[model samples]
Target chain A: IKELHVKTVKRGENVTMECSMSKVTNKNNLAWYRQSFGKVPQYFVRYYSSNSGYKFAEGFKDSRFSMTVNDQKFDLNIIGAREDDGGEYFCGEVEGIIIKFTSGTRLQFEGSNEGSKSSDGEGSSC
Target chain B: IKELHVKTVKRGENVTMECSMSKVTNKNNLAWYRQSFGKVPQYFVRYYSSNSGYKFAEGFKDSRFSMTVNDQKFDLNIIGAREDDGGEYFCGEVEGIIIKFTSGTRLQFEGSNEGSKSSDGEGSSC
Candidate 1:
């Protein structure tokens, strides 16, 4: 029942965040989104309607991230990034509503100047 | 953990697909992808590095679909669409490794000509 939640991370280092919802009827649409630095959030994936899973904005590369869907859960992947990776990540149900969005995971990508080492190690937390 | 798993539906009619994952760590990168009707899948959302909540590719409008994140779970939303919304939906973790992707969700958008009534009803399934 929480509004949104996020994970804590240092700038420059990599991090992961996610969300979930309960079971319901009429599961027709699905999506994931990230909000602007301080603006209202927006949509990320229209998975149920398009075959092209990957969509990127201008000035952004297409190979930076990817999305995967399984049952009622959805996840986003970000490869190599610096402090620019700091922001909030949110997950939600699409098309049909009636359910509350799980809390979102907020990630703070701290720069190496913060005394944190950027770990390229293999870390998978979901 | 299971591979990617999705749902199935007829043509014309609207449906939903979802994915889930077991517990793990190092969820640093999160992405969603969809292959062409016949091509390999691509990236959708790269949450570990940027704050641009909604990113739309060229020739594509940014109002049809939406995304949200809540911890380890994410969801995508499709407002209203025809058969163009049929494909495989995947949910995955970001940043770390050692864990495989949970199954993915497959959604089939039945075209109206396929006899599946286009339900304008507020359908919400997760």
Candidate 2:
């Protein structure tokens, strides 16, 4: 089993987290997850078939999160961001309701970067 | 819908992965799992009740890996590690067979790491 790794980048810049597996090459069966502090890790993206591509985890409404599968590795990307995005991110496969982490990326936002934007009922953090 | 986060350290160091949840007071429903490269993520340690404590995933036969519950947060720990123990560690509640991440803690190894130890037909990495 190979441990996956990623380089954390600043906001508005693209960040990628890769999940590297062993010799198996069932690319279509991989999945991805998102985690933070004080809560259960939220589901992110999942890849079904070669043509079907991938699917995002529910509850994640941001358009910036996306994924791409290349042979034995899965690249999960986040484009552009706010302060709230600053936290630990992970990539793994789906087991029941769990998304096992093959690797993780710690996203630390800079002072200029704003956190997530909360609406009327939601609160914002920086 | 909150996210969890964890800290990753090097091998041989006693590392602890914590999982926190919001508005959640009941600690009996959480579960943990482990996933390798290409195959599915296997079940790991799980916490049922306080004092009653936790349980590990199905196929994990290691004794160094353990878990503890403190108030609202659940923690998974690996004591006196080896190079093979390096990988992403996740703490979350069960969502069917899936272990959803609220946050993730990655355990990575430096050089001299031997990856996973292969058993009869199993494998290893670092």
Candidate 3:
């Protein structure tokens, strides 16, 4: 259950982080989160797989954030990446008592020294 | 499922927010959240019905925070309420693509004039 993508994009270019739900076989909804080191994951966007163009959490309403759902893949798109956008992004599955998050993809600016090239996020071990 | 309980306690007394999942048929997880007005909900605690004494999110590890799950209920208890503990608390259900929440019970202090008696949270339409 690993897609393990790491992006080293130049600033101002757009980026996509894909979350595959192929192994997911239920009605649980998918929520997207952004985690900075030493901080709890932030809830930013959520929607179901039977849906398209998921809902973005508040403060993420700028035209820069978008999402799409295809078959078993849910992807998050950030237009015009900024210096502050580099972090680990996760696709979280929600169900009562059990919350499952994929091993997230790390995003780093090409010329910036934000994080190591490691593909895993700084949140709890996946 | 409507537990619909609200408490207006003195500043030193304890407070509890109960979330009911009697109608929940599947094995979705229950997560507790605290929301200040005009901000997104913050995740604090999470657990399932098959367990006891749920887990507190990172910053919420203060000994004052506790949770318990019974036949059909999930409750959060904060001992020795402080001025900042007065707000809306919610019982949220997590499942892939389908997140449901109880119209939370609002917590207010008796002499503090913190919020209205209308017991609904500020997160979103539950």
Candidate 4:
């Protein structure tokens, strides 16, 4: 597992959250899931490492969500971020059917309302 | 876990799917998850058995979807079902975060293009 590094990168801008491990042994093995605090964790996106294929959560085909896997690092890129995109992002290592975690990252929009209405939202910060 | 019982009720029709266990020993311990053939299982709804409280997937408050829990039985009711609401649903016993399943059921609409547009859809066939 890995720790998510970074902070609010302003809405409408692009942001990428990173996760890593000593070695990712398989394709489609590394993935990311977004969880709005208090809701179910929704699968985000995952890169199949050097093999280069992605299995996104169904219905999440918005081209804005993409990822890159460079060796052991798996990153989630949210293009043109939205105020609605704020939530706990967990970068996960899916080894076997059971998922083990990484440290998670909670993303907030700069100057956005802190005590606000939230949604099912992600980081290793899995 | 229990088996889901039903068929494509047609659009605009109301339908209820059922599940049961020998005993439910905890609150918020019984749950439901919907999955399209090959996607991440999305948490759907769960009842607090006799206590009568439900936690739905965040942002899924369509009012058309609801549940009723009677003793060992947990049932999912979809009112005015839509073509898009078809999929494999698993009625699960949440012993821990790791979900153990019941037989699943798939909800389909009558006249739905079988090989047509597929979707993130559900049952005990879960």
lDDT on C-alpha atoms for all candidate structures: 0.43, 0.57, 0.63, 0.60
Chain A TM-score compared with the true chain A, each model in order:
0.59, 0.64, 0.74, 0.69
The per-residue C-alpha lDDT of model 1 at residue A48 equals 46
Under the 3 Å rule for N, CA and C atoms, how many clashes does model 4 have? 30
**Predicted candidate 1 versus true structure: per-residue lDDT over B8-105, tens digit per residue:** 44533434334332363343444455432432234454334335343432335546566654454455666564555675554444321111234345
Ranking by TM-score: 2, 3, 4, 1
Tell me the tens digit of each residue's lDDT in model 3 across B30-64: 67766443233456677643457467776654888
Instruction: Evaluate fnat for each of the predicted models and list the values in order.
Output: 0.00, 0.37, 0.22, 0.00
| Worst-scoring 10-residue span by lDDT in model 2 chain A | A117-126
Cα displacement (angstroms), candidate 3, residue B74, comes to: 14
Error of 1 at B15 (Å): 42
| Cα RMSD of predicted structure 4 | 17.0
Ranking of predictions according to DockQ: 2, 3, 4, 1
Runs in model 4 deviating more than 4 A are A1-126, B1-6, B21-27, B49-51, B113-126
Tens digit per residue, CA lDDT, model 1, A1-126: 233344445533444444343442333433455543332234554344345443443334546566554564455666654455655545544321111233455555442244437455434321
Q: After superposition, how far is residue B56 of candidate 4 from its true place, in Å?
A: 1.4
